[PDB]
């Protein structure tokens, strides 16, 4: 059973747009949705999680 | 005739801590979507991490 | 409101492996499934299909 | 120490028509996915073309 990384992106109530927060790893992009949630949220009230799998990332180069 | 999909953009400044979500735009591929954001959201500033993801690969949280 | 492309591979109840058998366009991923399904099977008994973004598919160079 | 997440490999022949899918491999990039399925899976065949996906981006229909 595989374990990729994903990255998480959080806006929160308050916010305006979803601020990177972290990576964690988990089967699928639900239970990375209740990974953040949990881990990342202090499970507030009106918060939007992003979940992306990190090759689905692309990088600017330094 | 080219496909131009949909792409998020996310950007971390020169003193920036994190990636910030700045905006979307339609490119035919990852490096013109890179270089679009370049132009259209950072203006070639020095010190600033861009990051692109098709939005088919965001999986968002249920209202 | 978003219309992607998509990739679509078949396994056919007989066959041993996924093949391409083409591309549509949809607004997500379970919709790709029941447009593939309609239109490149016959409504059949047992057979999988899979749907990816072509974003996410690289290719060898020429 | 990188990531090395699961990527399906597609194939199709010289002579073949589409691709077909013909295993996984585990890979740090596209690009070294393609590098590995050339070398384990078309043993750099000329006139081959080879697809590469990760995992994560591919939905299955429900048995």
Partial sequence: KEWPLWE????SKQG???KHCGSLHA???QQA?????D???RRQEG??????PSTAITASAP
């Fill in 39 to 41: 881990v990342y949220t």
């Fill in 8 to 11: 998480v992106f959080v806006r």
């Fill in 47 to 52: 918060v939007s999680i992003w979940v992306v």
């Fill in 33 to 37: 949705l209740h990974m953040a949630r």
């Fill in 16 to 18: 305006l747009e979803h």
């Fill in 27 to 29: 089967t699928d992009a």
